[PDB]
mmCIF file with all atom_site columns, all heavy atoms in Angstrom:
data_model
loop_
_atom_site.group_PDB
_atom_site.id
_atom_site.type_symbol
_atom_site.label_atom_id
_atom_site.label_alt_id
_atom_site.label_comp_id
_atom_site.label_asym_id
_atom_site.label_entity_id
_atom_site.label_seq_id
_atom_site.pdbx_PDB_ins_code
_atom_site.Cartn_x
_atom_site.Cartn_y
_atom_site.Cartn_z
_atom_site.occupancy
_atom_site.B_iso_or_equiv
_atom_site.pdbx_formal_charge
_atom_site.auth_seq_id
_atom_site.auth_comp_id
_atom_site.auth_asym_id
_atom_site.auth_atom_id
_atom_site.pdbx_PDB_model_num
ATOM 1   N N   . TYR A 1 1  ? 24.077 -172.793 29.827 1.00 14.90 ? 1  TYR A N   1
ATOM 2   C CA  . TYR A 1 1  ? 22.772 -172.623 29.179 1.00 14.90 ? 1  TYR A CA  1
ATOM 3   C C   . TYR A 1 1  ? 22.319 -173.969 28.571 1.00 14.90 ? 1  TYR A C   1
ATOM 4   O O   . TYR A 1 1  ? 23.238 -174.728 28.136 1.00 14.90 ? 1  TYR A O   1
ATOM 5   C CB  . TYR A 1 1  ? 22.913 -171.690 27.983 1.00 14.90 ? 1  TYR A CB  1
ATOM 6   C CG  . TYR A 1 1  ? 23.153 -170.269 28.322 1.00 14.90 ? 1  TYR A CG  1
ATOM 7   C CD1 . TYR A 1 1  ? 24.407 -169.663 28.093 1.00 14.90 ? 1  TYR A CD1 1
ATOM 8   C CD2 . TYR A 1 1  ? 22.126 -169.507 28.850 1.00 14.90 ? 1  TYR A CD2 1
ATOM 9   C CE1 . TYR A 1 1  ? 24.608 -168.323 28.412 1.00 14.90 ? 1  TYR A CE1 1
ATOM 10  C CE2 . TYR A 1 1  ? 22.334 -168.164 29.145 1.00 14.90 ? 1  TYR A CE2 1
ATOM 11  C CZ  . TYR A 1 1  ? 23.556 -167.579 28.956 1.00 14.90 ? 1  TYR A CZ  1
ATOM 12  O OH  . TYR A 1 1  ? 23.700 -166.300 29.238 1.00 14.90 ? 1  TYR A OH  1
ATOM 13  N N   . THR A 1 2  ? 21.032 -174.162 28.439 1.00 14.11 ? 2  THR A N   1
ATOM 14  C CA  . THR A 1 2  ? 20.511 -175.409 27.901 1.00 14.11 ? 2  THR A CA  1
ATOM 15  C C   . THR A 1 2  ? 19.613 -175.109 26.759 1.00 14.11 ? 2  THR A C   1
ATOM 16  O O   . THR A 1 2  ? 19.560 -175.907 25.835 1.00 14.11 ? 2  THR A O   1
ATOM 17  C CB  . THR A 1 2  ? 19.774 -176.258 28.983 1.00 14.11 ? 2  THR A CB  1
ATOM 18  O OG1 . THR A 1 2  ? 18.529 -175.646 29.284 1.00 14.11 ? 2  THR A OG1 1
ATOM 19  C CG2 . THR A 1 2  ? 20.593 -176.400 30.306 1.00 14.11 ? 2  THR A CG2 1
ATOM 20  N N   . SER A 1 3  ? 18.933 -173.996 26.758 1.00 11.97 ? 3  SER A N   1
ATOM 21  C CA  . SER A 1 3  ? 17.890 -173.706 25.715 1.00 11.97 ? 3  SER A CA  1
ATOM 22  C C   . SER A 1 3  ? 17.818 -172.304 25.232 1.00 11.97 ? 3  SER A C   1
ATOM 23  O O   . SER A 1 3  ? 18.158 -171.299 25.972 1.00 11.97 ? 3  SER A O   1
ATOM 24  C CB  . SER A 1 3  ? 16.573 -174.148 26.489 1.00 11.97 ? 3  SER A CB  1
ATOM 25  O OG  . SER A 1 3  ? 15.506 -174.057 25.596 1.00 11.97 ? 3  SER A OG  1
ATOM 26  N N   . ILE A 1 4  ? 17.438 -172.010 23.985 1.00 11.86 ? 4  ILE A N   1
ATOM 27  C CA  . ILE A 1 4  ? 17.202 -170.640 23.524 1.00 11.86 ? 4  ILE A CA  1
ATOM 28  C C   . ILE A 1 4  ? 15.958 -170.168 24.294 1.00 11.86 ? 4  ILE A C   1
ATOM 29  O O   . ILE A 1 4  ? 14.872 -170.799 24.297 1.00 11.86 ? 4  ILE A O   1
ATOM 30  C CB  . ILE A 1 4  ? 16.896 -170.562 21.999 1.00 11.86 ? 4  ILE A CB  1
ATOM 31  C CG1 . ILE A 1 4  ? 18.187 -170.365 21.220 1.00 11.86 ? 4  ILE A CG1 1
ATOM 32  C CG2 . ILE A 1 4  ? 15.891 -169.552 21.566 1.00 11.86 ? 4  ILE A CG2 1
ATOM 33  C CD1 . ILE A 1 4  ? 18.118 -171.035 19.826 1.00 11.86 ? 4  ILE A CD1 1
ATOM 34  N N   . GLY A 1 5  ? 16.141 -169.084 25.000 1.00 7.05  ? 5  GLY A N   1
ATOM 35  C CA  . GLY A 1 5  ? 15.001 -168.404 25.608 1.00 7.05  ? 5  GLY A CA  1
ATOM 36  C C   . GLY A 1 5  ? 14.546 -168.877 26.923 1.00 7.05  ? 5  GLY A C   1
ATOM 37  O O   . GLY A 1 5  ? 13.494 -168.316 27.484 1.00 7.05  ? 5  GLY A O   1
ATOM 38  N N   . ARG A 1 6  ? 15.195 -169.881 27.503 1.00 6.03  ? 6  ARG A N   1
ATOM 39  C CA  . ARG A 1 6  ? 14.742 -170.136 28.935 1.00 6.03  ? 6  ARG A CA  1
ATOM 40  C C   . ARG A 1 6  ? 16.010 -170.026 29.735 1.00 6.03  ? 6  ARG A C   1
ATOM 41  O O   . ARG A 1 6  ? 17.086 -170.164 29.151 1.00 6.03  ? 6  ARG A O   1
ATOM 42  C CB  . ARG A 1 6  ? 13.941 -171.353 29.012 1.00 6.03  ? 6  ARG A CB  1
ATOM 43  C CG  . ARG A 1 6  ? 14.130 -172.387 27.909 1.00 6.03  ? 6  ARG A CG  1
ATOM 44  C CD  . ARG A 1 6  ? 13.296 -172.062 26.777 1.00 6.03  ? 6  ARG A CD  1
ATOM 45  N NE  . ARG A 1 6  ? 12.134 -173.034 26.688 1.00 6.03  ? 6  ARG A NE  1
ATOM 46  C CZ  . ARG A 1 6  ? 11.907 -173.439 25.398 1.00 6.03  ? 6  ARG A CZ  1
ATOM 47  N NH1 . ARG A 1 6  ? 12.798 -173.137 24.427 1.00 6.03  ? 6  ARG A NH1 1
ATOM 48  N NH2 . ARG A 1 6  ? 10.672 -173.886 25.096 1.00 6.03  ? 6  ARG A NH2 1
ATOM 49  N N   . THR A 1 7  ? 15.841 -169.764 30.988 1.00 7.47  ? 7  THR A N   1
ATOM 50  C CA  . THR A 1 7  ? 16.891 -169.535 31.960 1.00 7.47  ? 7  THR A CA  1
ATOM 51  C C   . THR A 1 7  ? 17.484 -170.774 32.555 1.00 7.47  ? 7  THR A C   1
ATOM 52  O O   . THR A 1 7  ? 18.491 -170.676 33.262 1.00 7.47  ? 7  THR A O   1
ATOM 53  C CB  . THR A 1 7  ? 16.378 -168.570 33.054 1.00 7.47  ? 7  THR A CB  1
ATOM 54  O OG1 . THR A 1 7  ? 15.380 -169.247 33.771 1.00 7.47  ? 7  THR A OG1 1
ATOM 55  C CG2 . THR A 1 7  ? 15.737 -167.309 32.407 1.00 7.47  ? 7  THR A CG2 1
ATOM 56  N N   . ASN A 1 8  ? 16.813 -171.915 32.243 1.00 5.86  ? 8  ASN A N   1
ATOM 57  C CA  . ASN A 1 8  ? 17.143 -173.214 32.680 1.00 5.86  ? 8  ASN A CA  1
ATOM 58  C C   . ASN A 1 8  ? 18.683 -173.571 32.520 1.00 5.86  ? 8  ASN A C   1
ATOM 59  O O   . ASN A 1 8  ? 19.172 -173.359 31.415 1.00 5.86  ? 8  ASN A O   1
ATOM 60  C CB  . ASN A 1 8  ? 16.517 -174.383 31.949 1.00 5.86  ? 8  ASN A CB  1
ATOM 61  C CG  . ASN A 1 8  ? 15.143 -174.338 31.498 1.00 5.86  ? 8  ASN A CG  1
ATOM 62  O OD1 . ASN A 1 8  ? 14.258 -173.675 32.096 1.00 5.86  ? 8  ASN A OD1 1
ATOM 63  N ND2 . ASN A 1 8  ? 14.908 -175.134 30.438 1.00 5.86  ? 8  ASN A ND2 1
ATOM 64  N N   . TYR A 1 9  ? 19.138 -174.185 33.538 1.00 5.49  ? 9  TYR A N   1
ATOM 65  C CA  . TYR A 1 9  ? 20.486 -174.722 33.649 1.00 5.49  ? 9  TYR A CA  1
ATOM 66  C C   . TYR A 1 9  ? 20.385 -176.254 33.775 1.00 5.49  ? 9  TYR A C   1
ATOM 67  O O   . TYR A 1 9  ? 19.357 -176.797 34.196 1.00 5.49  ? 9  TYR A O   1
ATOM 68  C CB  . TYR A 1 9  ? 21.221 -174.114 34.790 1.00 5.49  ? 9  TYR A CB  1
ATOM 69  C CG  . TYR A 1 9  ? 20.624 -174.116 36.176 1.00 5.49  ? 9  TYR A CG  1
ATOM 70  C CD1 . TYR A 1 9  ? 21.075 -175.054 37.066 1.00 5.49  ? 9  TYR A CD1 1
ATOM 71  C CD2 . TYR A 1 9  ? 19.747 -173.163 36.657 1.00 5.49  ? 9  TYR A CD2 1
ATOM 72  C CE1 . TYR A 1 9  ? 20.634 -175.046 38.388 1.00 5.49  ? 9  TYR A CE1 1
ATOM 73  C CE2 . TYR A 1 9  ? 19.280 -173.177 37.953 1.00 5.49  ? 9  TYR A CE2 1
ATOM 74  C CZ  . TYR A 1 9  ? 19.720 -174.119 38.854 1.00 5.49  ? 9  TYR A CZ  1
ATOM 75  O OH  . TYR A 1 9  ? 19.313 -174.201 40.151 1.00 5.49  ? 9  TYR A OH  1
ATOM 76  N N   . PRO A 1 10 ? 21.448 -176.944 33.418 1.00 4.99  ? 10 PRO A N   1
ATOM 77  C CA  . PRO A 1 10 ? 21.506 -178.381 33.451 1.00 4.99  ? 10 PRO A CA  1
ATOM 78  C C   . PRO A 1 10 ? 21.550 -179.009 34.808 1.00 4.99  ? 10 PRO A C   1
ATOM 79  O O   . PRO A 1 10 ? 22.246 -178.454 35.738 1.00 4.99  ? 10 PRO A O   1
ATOM 80  C CB  . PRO A 1 10 ? 22.788 -178.590 32.611 1.00 4.99  ? 10 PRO A CB  1
ATOM 81  C CG  . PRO A 1 10 ? 23.671 -177.476 32.890 1.00 4.99  ? 10 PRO A CG  1
ATOM 82  C CD  . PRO A 1 10 ? 22.761 -176.321 33.038 1.00 4.99  ? 10 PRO A CD  1
ATOM 83  N N   . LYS A 1 11 ? 20.956 -180.210 35.026 1.00 5.34  ? 11 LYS A N   1
ATOM 84  C CA  . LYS A 1 11 ? 20.988 -180.870 36.358 1.00 5.34  ? 11 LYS A CA  1
ATOM 85  C C   . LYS A 1 11 ? 22.303 -181.482 36.693 1.00 5.34  ? 11 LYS A C   1
ATOM 86  O O   . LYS A 1 11 ? 22.944 -182.005 35.708 1.00 5.34  ? 11 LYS A O   1
ATOM 87  C CB  . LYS A 1 11 ? 20.018 -182.092 36.472 1.00 5.34  ? 11 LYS A CB  1
ATOM 88  C CG  . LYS A 1 11 ? 18.796 -181.919 35.560 1.00 5.34  ? 11 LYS A CG  1
ATOM 89  C CD  . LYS A 1 11 ? 17.551 -182.764 36.145 1.00 5.34  ? 11 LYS A CD  1
ATOM 90  C CE  . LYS A 1 11 ? 17.283 -183.725 34.855 1.00 5.34  ? 11 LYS A CE  1
ATOM 91  N NZ  . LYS A 1 11 ? 15.842 -184.217 34.874 1.00 5.34  ? 11 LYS A NZ  1
ATOM 92  N N   . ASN A 1 12 ? 22.585 -181.588 37.964 1.00 5.90  ? 12 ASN A N   1
ATOM 93  C CA  . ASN A 1 12 ? 23.981 -182.149 38.273 1.00 5.90  ? 12 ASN A CA  1
ATOM 94  C C   . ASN A 1 12 ? 24.868 -181.365 37.198 1.00 5.90  ? 12 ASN A C   1
ATOM 95  O O   . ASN A 1 12 ? 25.176 -181.889 36.138 1.00 5.90  ? 12 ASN A O   1
ATOM 96  C CB  . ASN A 1 12 ? 24.273 -183.604 38.119 1.00 5.90  ? 12 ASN A CB  1
ATOM 97  C CG  . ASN A 1 12 ? 23.052 -184.522 38.057 1.00 5.90  ? 12 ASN A CG  1
ATOM 98  O OD1 . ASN A 1 12 ? 22.730 -185.190 36.980 1.00 5.90  ? 12 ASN A OD1 1
ATOM 99  N ND2 . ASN A 1 12 ? 22.303 -184.558 39.229 1.00 5.90  ? 12 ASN A ND2 1
ATOM 100 N N   . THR A 1 13 ? 25.042 -180.160 37.683 1.00 7.54  ? 13 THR A N   1
ATOM 101 C CA  . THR A 1 13 ? 25.941 -179.192 36.979 1.00 7.54  ? 13 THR A CA  1
ATOM 102 C C   . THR A 1 13 ? 27.184 -179.195 37.803 1.00 7.54  ? 13 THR A C   1
ATOM 103 O O   . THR A 1 13 ? 27.087 -180.112 38.717 1.00 7.54  ? 13 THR A O   1
ATOM 104 C CB  . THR A 1 13 ? 25.137 -177.824 36.981 1.00 7.54  ? 13 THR A CB  1
ATOM 105 O OG1 . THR A 1 13 ? 25.696 -177.231 35.746 1.00 7.54  ? 13 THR A OG1 1
ATOM 106 C CG2 . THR A 1 13 ? 25.274 -176.997 38.250 1.00 7.54  ? 13 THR A CG2 1
ATOM 107 N N   . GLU A 1 14 ? 28.248 -178.465 37.667 1.00 6.23  ? 14 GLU A N   1
ATOM 108 C CA  . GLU A 1 14 ? 29.344 -178.591 38.741 1.00 6.23  ? 14 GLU A CA  1
ATOM 109 C C   . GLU A 1 14 ? 29.433 -177.360 39.554 1.00 6.23  ? 14 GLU A C   1
ATOM 110 O O   . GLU A 1 14 ? 28.967 -176.245 39.059 1.00 6.23  ? 14 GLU A O   1
ATOM 111 C CB  . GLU A 1 14 ? 30.657 -178.759 38.089 1.00 6.23  ? 14 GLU A CB  1
ATOM 112 C CG  . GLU A 1 14 ? 30.828 -180.243 37.753 1.00 6.23  ? 14 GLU A CG  1
ATOM 113 C CD  . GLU A 1 14 ? 32.302 -180.507 37.399 1.00 6.23  ? 14 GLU A CD  1
ATOM 114 O OE1 . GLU A 1 14 ? 32.703 -179.713 36.435 1.00 6.23  ? 14 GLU A OE1 1
ATOM 115 O OE2 . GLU A 1 14 ? 32.930 -181.429 38.063 1.00 6.23  ? 14 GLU A OE2 1
ATOM 116 N N   . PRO A 1 15 ? 30.010 -177.464 40.703 1.00 7.29  ? 15 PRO A N   1
ATOM 117 C CA  . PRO A 1 15 ? 30.141 -176.221 41.587 1.00 7.29  ? 15 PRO A CA  1
ATOM 118 C C   . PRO A 1 15 ? 30.846 -175.189 40.697 1.00 7.29  ? 15 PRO A C   1
ATOM 119 O O   . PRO A 1 15 ? 31.784 -175.486 39.966 1.00 7.29  ? 15 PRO A O   1
ATOM 120 C CB  . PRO A 1 15 ? 30.824 -176.753 42.776 1.00 7.29  ? 15 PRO A CB  1
ATOM 121 C CG  . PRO A 1 15 ? 30.781 -178.214 42.663 1.00 7.29  ? 15 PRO A CG  1
ATOM 122 C CD  . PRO A 1 15 ? 31.106 -178.357 41.052 1.00 7.29  ? 15 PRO A CD  1
ATOM 123 N N   . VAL A 1 16 ? 30.288 -173.991 40.730 1.00 6.90  ? 16 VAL A N   1
ATOM 124 C CA  . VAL A 1 16 ? 30.810 -172.882 39.906 1.00 6.90  ? 16 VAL A CA  1
ATOM 125 C C   . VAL A 1 16 ? 31.756 -172.089 40.748 1.00 6.90  ? 16 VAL A C   1
ATOM 126 O O   . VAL A 1 16 ? 32.631 -171.381 40.142 1.00 6.90  ? 16 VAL A O   1
ATOM 127 C CB  . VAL A 1 16 ? 29.594 -172.127 39.348 1.00 6.90  ? 16 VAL A CB  1
ATOM 128 C CG1 . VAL A 1 16 ? 28.537 -172.103 40.494 1.00 6.90  ? 16 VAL A CG1 1
ATOM 129 C CG2 . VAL A 1 16 ? 29.889 -170.804 38.900 1.00 6.90  ? 16 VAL A CG2 1
ATOM 130 N N   . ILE A 1 17 ? 31.749 -172.148 42.059 1.00 8.50  ? 17 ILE A N   1
ATOM 131 C CA  . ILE A 1 17 ? 32.750 -171.377 42.840 1.00 8.50  ? 17 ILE A CA  1
ATOM 132 C C   . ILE A 1 17 ? 33.967 -172.232 43.086 1.00 8.50  ? 17 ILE A C   1
ATOM 133 O O   . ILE A 1 17 ? 33.749 -173.322 43.750 1.00 8.50  ? 17 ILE A O   1
ATOM 134 C CB  . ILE A 1 17 ? 32.101 -170.956 44.185 1.00 8.50  ? 17 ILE A CB  1
ATOM 135 C CG1 . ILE A 1 17 ? 30.799 -170.205 43.981 1.00 8.50  ? 17 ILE A CG1 1
ATOM 136 C CG2 . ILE A 1 17 ? 33.123 -170.233 45.090 1.00 8.50  ? 17 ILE A CG2 1
ATOM 137 C CD1 . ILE A 1 17 ? 30.141 -169.813 45.360 1.00 8.50  ? 17 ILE A CD1 1
ATOM 138 N N   . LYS A 1 18 ? 35.145 -171.944 42.721 1.00 7.96  ? 18 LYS A N   1
ATOM 139 C CA  . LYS A 1 18 ? 36.393 -172.714 42.925 1.00 7.96  ? 18 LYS A CA  1
ATOM 140 C C   . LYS A 1 18 ? 36.657 -172.981 44.398 1.00 7.96  ? 18 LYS A C   1
ATOM 141 O O   . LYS A 1 18 ? 36.839 -171.955 45.198 1.00 7.96  ? 18 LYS A O   1
ATOM 142 C CB  . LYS A 1 18 ? 37.571 -171.748 42.561 1.00 7.96  ? 18 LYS A CB  1
ATOM 143 C CG  . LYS A 1 18 ? 38.272 -171.907 41.214 1.00 7.96  ? 18 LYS A CG  1
ATOM 144 C CD  . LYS A 1 18 ? 39.472 -170.796 41.190 1.00 7.96  ? 18 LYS A CD  1
ATOM 145 C CE  . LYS A 1 18 ? 39.586 -170.315 39.681 1.00 7.96  ? 18 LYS A CE  1
ATOM 146 N NZ  . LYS A 1 18 ? 40.876 -170.970 39.155 1.00 7.96  ? 18 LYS A NZ  1
ATOM 147 N N   . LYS A 1 19 ? 36.790 -174.195 44.785 1.00 8.78  ? 19 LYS A N   1
ATOM 148 C CA  . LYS A 1 19 ? 37.105 -174.538 46.186 1.00 8.78  ? 19 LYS A CA  1
ATOM 149 C C   . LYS A 1 19 ? 38.562 -174.224 46.486 1.00 8.78  ? 19 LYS A C   1
ATOM 150 O O   . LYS A 1 19 ? 39.450 -174.488 45.660 1.00 8.78  ? 19 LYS A O   1
ATOM 151 C CB  . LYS A 1 19 ? 36.914 -175.977 46.515 1.00 8.78  ? 19 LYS A CB  1
ATOM 152 C CG  . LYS A 1 19 ? 37.239 -176.344 47.952 1.00 8.78  ? 19 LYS A CG  1
ATOM 153 C CD  . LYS A 1 19 ? 36.876 -177.799 48.174 1.00 8.78  ? 19 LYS A CD  1
ATOM 154 C CE  . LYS A 1 19 ? 37.506 -178.244 49.497 1.00 8.78  ? 19 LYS A CE  1
ATOM 155 N NZ  . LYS A 1 19 ? 36.371 -178.942 50.260 1.00 8.78  ? 19 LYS A NZ  1
ATOM 156 N N   . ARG A 1 20 ? 38.789 -173.673 47.677 1.00 8.74  ? 20 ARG A N   1
ATOM 157 C CA  . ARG A 1 20 ? 40.135 -173.388 48.100 1.00 8.74  ? 20 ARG A CA  1
ATOM 158 C C   . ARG A 1 20 ? 40.993 -174.630 48.177 1.00 8.74  ? 20 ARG A C   1
ATOM 159 O O   . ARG A 1 20 ? 40.483 -175.696 48.615 1.00 8.74  ? 20 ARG A O   1
ATOM 160 C CB  . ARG A 1 20 ? 40.206 -172.899 49.613 1.00 8.74  ? 20 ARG A CB  1
ATOM 161 C CG  . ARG A 1 20 ? 39.764 -171.493 49.752 1.00 8.74  ? 20 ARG A CG  1
ATOM 162 C CD  . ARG A 1 20 ? 40.690 -170.587 50.552 1.00 8.74  ? 20 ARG A CD  1
ATOM 163 N NE  . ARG A 1 20 ? 39.766 -169.315 50.754 1.00 8.74  ? 20 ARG A NE  1
ATOM 164 C CZ  . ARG A 1 20 ? 40.525 -168.260 51.127 1.00 8.74  ? 20 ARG A CZ  1
ATOM 165 N NH1 . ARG A 1 20 ? 41.848 -168.383 51.141 1.00 8.74  ? 20 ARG A NH1 1
ATOM 166 N NH2 . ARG A 1 20 ? 39.818 -167.224 51.508 1.00 8.74  ? 20 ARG A NH2 1
ATOM 167 N N   . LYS A 1 21 ? 42.250 -174.370 47.862 1.00 7.96  ? 21 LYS A N   1
ATOM 168 C CA  . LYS A 1 21 ? 43.203 -175.642 48.134 1.00 7.96  ? 21 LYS A CA  1
ATOM 169 C C   . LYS A 1 21 ? 43.779 -175.257 49.466 1.00 7.96  ? 21 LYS A C   1
ATOM 170 O O   . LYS A 1 21 ? 44.877 -174.563 49.458 1.00 7.96  ? 21 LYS A O   1
ATOM 171 C CB  . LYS A 1 21 ? 44.124 -175.674 46.980 1.00 7.96  ? 21 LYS A CB  1
ATOM 172 C CG  . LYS A 1 21 ? 45.216 -176.754 47.028 1.00 7.96  ? 21 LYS A CG  1
ATOM 173 C CD  . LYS A 1 21 ? 46.463 -176.048 46.228 1.00 7.96  ? 21 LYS A CD  1
ATOM 174 C CE  . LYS A 1 21 ? 47.783 -176.673 46.963 1.00 7.96  ? 21 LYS A CE  1
ATOM 175 N NZ  . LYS A 1 21 ? 48.348 -177.691 45.801 1.00 7.96  ? 21 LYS A NZ  1
ATOM 176 N N   . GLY A 1 22 ? 43.129 -175.465 50.560 1.00 7.31  ? 22 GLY A N   1
ATOM 177 C CA  . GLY A 1 22 ? 43.658 -174.998 51.871 1.00 7.31  ? 22 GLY A CA  1
ATOM 178 C C   . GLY A 1 22 ? 42.486 -174.414 52.640 1.00 7.31  ? 22 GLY A C   1
ATOM 179 O O   . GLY A 1 22 ? 41.295 -174.660 52.270 1.00 7.31  ? 22 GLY A O   1
ATOM 180 N N   . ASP A 1 23 ? 42.690 -173.810 53.745 1.00 9.95  ? 23 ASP A N   1
ATOM 181 C CA  . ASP A 1 23 ? 41.911 -173.074 54.556 1.00 9.95  ? 23 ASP A CA  1
ATOM 182 C C   . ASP A 1 23 ? 41.236 -171.832 54.113 1.00 9.95  ? 23 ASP A C   1
ATOM 183 O O   . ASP A 1 23 ? 41.576 -171.267 53.039 1.00 9.95  ? 23 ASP A O   1
ATOM 184 C CB  . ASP A 1 23 ? 43.269 -172.199 55.338 1.00 9.95  ? 23 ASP A CB  1
ATOM 185 C CG  . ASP A 1 23 ? 43.038 -172.985 56.642 1.00 9.95  ? 23 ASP A CG  1
ATOM 186 O OD1 . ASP A 1 23 ? 41.761 -173.357 56.532 1.00 9.95  ? 23 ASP A OD1 1
ATOM 187 O OD2 . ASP A 1 23 ? 43.831 -173.245 57.484 1.00 9.95  ? 23 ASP A OD2 1
ATOM 188 N N   . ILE A 1 24 ? 40.336 -171.366 55.083 1.00 9.24  ? 24 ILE A N   1
ATOM 189 C CA  . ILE A 1 24 ? 39.827 -169.977 54.762 1.00 9.24  ? 24 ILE A CA  1
ATOM 190 C C   . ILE A 1 24 ? 41.091 -169.039 54.870 1.00 9.24  ? 24 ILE A C   1
ATOM 191 O O   . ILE A 1 24 ? 41.180 -168.041 54.131 1.00 9.24  ? 24 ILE A O   1
ATOM 192 C CB  . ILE A 1 24 ? 38.713 -169.495 55.634 1.00 9.24  ? 24 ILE A CB  1
ATOM 193 C CG1 . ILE A 1 24 ? 37.778 -168.459 54.849 1.00 9.24  ? 24 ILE A CG1 1
ATOM 194 C CG2 . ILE A 1 24 ? 39.175 -168.753 56.909 1.00 9.24  ? 24 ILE A CG2 1
ATOM 195 C CD1 . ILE A 1 24 ? 36.631 -168.018 55.911 1.00 9.24  ? 24 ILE A CD1 1
ATOM 196 N N   . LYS A 1 25 ? 41.962 -169.451 55.808 1.00 7.18  ? 25 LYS A N   1
ATOM 197 C CA  . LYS A 1 25 ? 43.137 -168.681 56.106 1.00 7.18  ? 25 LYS A CA  1
ATOM 198 C C   . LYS A 1 25 ? 44.178 -168.710 55.023 1.00 7.18  ? 25 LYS A C   1
ATOM 199 O O   . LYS A 1 25 ? 45.161 -167.848 55.104 1.00 7.18  ? 25 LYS A O   1
ATOM 200 C CB  . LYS A 1 25 ? 43.772 -169.092 57.414 1.00 7.18  ? 25 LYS A CB  1
ATOM 201 C CG  . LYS A 1 25 ? 42.995 -168.701 58.637 1.00 7.18  ? 25 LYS A CG  1
ATOM 202 C CD  . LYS A 1 25 ? 42.455 -169.994 59.214 1.00 7.18  ? 25 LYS A CD  1
ATOM 203 C CE  . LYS A 1 25 ? 43.493 -170.665 60.129 1.00 7.18  ? 25 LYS A CE  1
ATOM 204 N NZ  . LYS A 1 25 ? 42.992 -170.237 61.598 1.00 7.18  ? 25 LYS A NZ  1
ATOM 205 N N   . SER A 1 26 ? 44.099 -169.587 54.060 1.00 8.30  ? 26 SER A N   1
ATOM 206 C CA  . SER A 1 26 ? 45.123 -169.710 52.984 1.00 8.30  ? 26 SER A CA  1
ATOM 207 C C   . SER A 1 26 ? 45.410 -168.578 52.103 1.00 8.30  ? 26 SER A C   1
ATOM 208 O O   . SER A 1 26 ? 44.325 -167.902 51.756 1.00 8.30  ? 26 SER A O   1
ATOM 209 C CB  . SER A 1 26 ? 44.314 -170.639 51.893 1.00 8.30  ? 26 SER A CB  1
ATOM 210 O OG  . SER A 1 26 ? 44.611 -171.987 52.419 1.00 8.30  ? 26 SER A OG  1
#
C-alpha cells in the first residue's frame, strides 16, 4: 500500500509470486 484511500501500489515493486527453484516439474 502507498496511500490512505487509494488502491495505488508502488512502482518497481517486486514479483509477488515466488519463483520456483527448479522446473515446472520440480
